[PDB]
């Protein structure tokens, strides 16, 4: 079993969250710009804690990925196919949220 | 007859990688714009709740806590968080 | 063993990066700032990256692994078939490190066929296909579980660490609760509508 480094100045849970941040797949600038695009339709005086944008991105990426997980799990073929919208939709009706 | 849509936003490679992270190795043309659409809707849903909380507290700033309360109401994604 | 002094300085730096990340996490961004490449969100992100690099170099100095204790580091065993060759192969396939490890059915089937043809188990094609389907299902459930737990045990920051569901303002304010309920009906319709929209477009092509 490998040896684990445990910093004295910083807890590992913090480290884990920062790491995950580096694992996000959508460029952060276009993401915050998408949040801005949405927000200006609500109120022009709205502000966001930076950490709120972080929470939004992490949750959003998990939401999209799980859509594809469900689609994947519902797709059973001897030879690979290309995933289309109807596959997403069908999977969602089968194992997804209603 | 094929046409390339112009996009300022989430690029094809990120969407291909998100799909791949889901185990999906190949996706249609409509998938990219669907992923942008779906993303936008999810975010709208969350932010609509978050701002309902922000205004209930009489603040002009949406905080991380507002976003948590909103996310918990979006179904399975954050299910179980905090207990 | 690494230099105690240098470890000490590097750990102080690490703590400095943390303090600055928290500071940035608390910054409030107006709409113009969300249009800004230099926003506190992007500053914080870049700092998290710097910190992770430093953490890695400290692991190197401590001769420890690079592991942080993430849930996705936890191994998912698979004993599901009557052939241990196949089983170990599937377990192998689902425990590859990283955020991206999620096989498709073809991956599972290929692992099963490879284990079979390798070990000359003389399994016909339909037995292989059925084994692969059952296995893919099992491993699918466990992979989704591990990602879910990794998400909810790793979510947010200090500002959200005191969250508990029993504190939701909605619980004590029926007006707020009614608005949220309305919102929820809309949210559900909007998501269904976008899904349906792209299916309905897929047809017209």
From Swiss-Prot, chain A:
The nucleosome is a histone octamer containing two molecules each of H2A, H2B, H3 and H4 assembled in one H3-H4 heterotetramer and two H2A-H2B heterodimers. The octamer wraps approximately 147 bp of DNA. Interacts with HIRA, a chaperone required for its incorporation into nucleosomes. Interacts with ZMYND11; when trimethylated at 'Lys-36' (H3.3K36me3). Found in a co-chaperone complex with DNJC9, MCM2 and histone H3.3-H4 dimers. Within the complex, interacts with DNJC9 (via C-terminus); the interaction is direct. Interacts with ASF1A, MCM2, NASP and SPT2. The modification N6-crotonyllysine is found at residue 20. This is Histone H3.3. Changing residue 45 to H: In BRYLIB1; uncertain significance. One of its GO terms (molecular function) is structural constituent of chromatin. Changing residue 25 to R: In BRYLIB1; uncertain significance. Variant histone H3 which replaces conventional H3 in a wide range of nucleosomes in active genes. Constitutes the predominant form of histone H3 in non-dividing cells and is incorporated into chromatin independently of DNA synthesis. Deposited at sites of nucleosomal displacement throughout transcribed genes, suggesting that it represents an epigenetic imprint of transcriptionally active chromatin. Nucleosomes wrap and compact DNA into chromatin, limiting DNA accessibility to the cellular machineries which require DNA as a template. It comes from Homo sapiens (Human). The modification N6-acetyllysine is found at residues 20, 43, 79, 86. The lineage of its organism: Eukaryota, Metazoa, Chordata, Craniata, Vertebrata. Keywords: Acetylation, ADP-ribosylation, Chromosome, Citrullination, Disease variant, DNA-binding, Hydroxylation, Intellectual disability, Lipoprotein, Methylation, Nucleosome core, Nucleus, Phosphoprotein, Ubl conjugation. The modification N6-succinyllysine is found at residues 20, 43, 86. The keyword Lipoprotein applies. Changing residue 3 to R: In BRYLIB2; uncertain significance. It comes from the Eukaryota. The modification N6-lactoyllysine is found at residues 20, 43. One of its GO terms (biological process) is subtelomeric heterochromatin formation. The modification N6,N6,N6-trimethyllysine is found at residues 20, 43. The modification Phosphoserine is found at residues 21, 50. Its main location: nucleus. The modification Phosphotyrosine is found at residue 5. Changing residue 81 to L: In BRYLIB1; uncertain significance.
UniProtKB/Swiss-Prot annotation, chain B:
Acetylated as part of spermatogenesis progression prior to histone-to-protamine exchange. Demethylation is performed by JMJD6. The modification N6,N6,N6-trimethyllysine is found at residue 1. The gene is H4C1. Changing residue 75 to R: Found in a patient with a neurodevelopmental disorder; uncertain significance. The modification Phosphoserine is found at residue 28. The modification N6-propionyllysine is found at residues 12, 25, 58, 60, 72. The modification N6-(2-hydroxyisobutyryl)lysine is found at residues 12, 25, 40, 58, 60, 72. Changing residue 18 to P: In TEBIVANED3; results in early developmental defects when expressed in zebrafish embryos. There is a cross-link at residues 1, 12, 40, 60, 72 (Glycyl lysine isopeptide (Lys-Gly) (interchain with G-Cter in SUMO2)). Coiled coil: none annotated. The nucleosome is a histone octamer containing two molecules each of H2A, H2B, H3 and H4 assembled in one H3-H4 heterotetramer and two H2A-H2B heterodimers. The octamer wraps approximately 147 bp of DNA. Found in a co-chaperone complex with DNJC9, MCM2 and histone H3.3-H4 dimers. Within the complex, interacts with DNJC9 (via C-terminus); the interaction is direct. Interacts with NASP; NASP is a histone chaperone that stabilizes and maintains a soluble pool of Histone H3-H4 dimers. The modification N6-acetyllysine is found at residues 12, 72. The modification Phosphotyrosine is found at residues 32, 69. Its main location: nucleus. Keywords: Acetylation, Chromosomal rearrangement, Chromosome, Citrullination, Disease variant, DNA-binding, Hydroxylation, Intellectual disability, Isopeptide bond, Methylation, Nucleosome core, Nucleus, Phosphoprotein, Ubl conjugation. The modification N6-glutaryllysine is found at residues 12, 40, 58, 60, 72. Changing residue 21 to C: In TEBIVANED2 and TEBIVANED3; uncertain significance; does not affect early development when expressed in zebrafish embryos. This is Histone H4. One of its GO terms (molecular function) is structural constituent of chromatin. Belongs to the histone H4 family.
From Swiss-Prot, chain C:
Changing residue 41 to A/S: Abolishes interaction with histones H3 and H4. Residues 1-36, 177-205 form a coiled coil. Induction: Upon mitogenic stimulation by concanavalin-A. Ubiquitous. One of its GO terms (biological process) is cellular response to unfolded protein. The keyword Cell division does not apply. Belongs to the DAXX family. This is Death domain-associated protein 6. It comes from Homo sapiens (Human). The chain holds residues 182 to 386 of 740 of the full protein.
């Amino acid at each position: 079993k490998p040896h684990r480094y445990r910093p004295g100045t910083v807890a590992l849970r913090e480290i884990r969250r920062y790491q995950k941040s580096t694992e996000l797949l959508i460029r952060k600038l276009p993401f915050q710009r998408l949040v801005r695009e949405i927000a200006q339709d609500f109120k022009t005086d709205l502000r966001f804690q930076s950490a709120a944008i972080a929470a939004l991105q992490e949750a959003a990426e998990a939401f999209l990925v799980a859509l594809f997980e469900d689609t994947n799990l519902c797709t059973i073929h001897a030879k690979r196919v290309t995933i289309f919208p109807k596959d997403i939709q069908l999977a969602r009706r089968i194992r997804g949220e209603r | 007859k094929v046409l390339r849509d112009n996009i300022q936003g989430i690029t094809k490679p990120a969407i291909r990688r998100l799909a791949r992270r889901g185990g999906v190795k190949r996706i249609s043309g409509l998938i990219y714009e669907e992923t942008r659409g779906v993303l936008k809707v999810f975010l709208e849903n969350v932010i609509r709740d978050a701002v309902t909380y922000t205004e209930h507290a009489k603040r002009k700033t949406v905080t991380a806590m507002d976003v948590v309360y909103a996310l918990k109401r979006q179904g399975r994604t954050l299910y179980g968080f905090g207990g | 063993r690494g230099s105690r002094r240098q470890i000490q300085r590097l750990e102080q730096l690490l703590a400095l990066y943390v303090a600055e990340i928290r500071r940035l996490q608390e910054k409030e961004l107006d709409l113009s700032e969300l249009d800004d490449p230099d926003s506190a969100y992007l500053q914080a992100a870049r700092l998290k990256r710097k910190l992770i690099r430093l953490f890695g170099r400290l692991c190197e100095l401590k001769d420890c692994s690079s592991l942080t204790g993430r849930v996705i580091e936890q191994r998912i065993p698979y004993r599901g078939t009557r052939y241990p060759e196949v089983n170990r192969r599937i377990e192998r396939l689902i425990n590859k490190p990283g955020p991206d490890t999620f096989p498709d059915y073809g991956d599972v089937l290929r692992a099963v066929e490879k284990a079979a043809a390798r070990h000359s188990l003389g399994l016909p094609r339909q037995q292989l296909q059925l084994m692969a389907q059952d296995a893919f299902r099992d491993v699918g459930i466990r992979l989704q579980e591990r990602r879910h737990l990794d998400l909810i045990y790793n979510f947010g920051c200090h500002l959200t660490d005191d969250y508990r569901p029993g504190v939701d303002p909605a619980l004590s304010d029926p007006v707020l609760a009614r608005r949220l309920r309305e919102n929820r009906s809309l949210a559900m319709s909007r998501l269904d509508e976008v899904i349906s929209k792209y299916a309905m477009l897929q047809d017209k092509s």
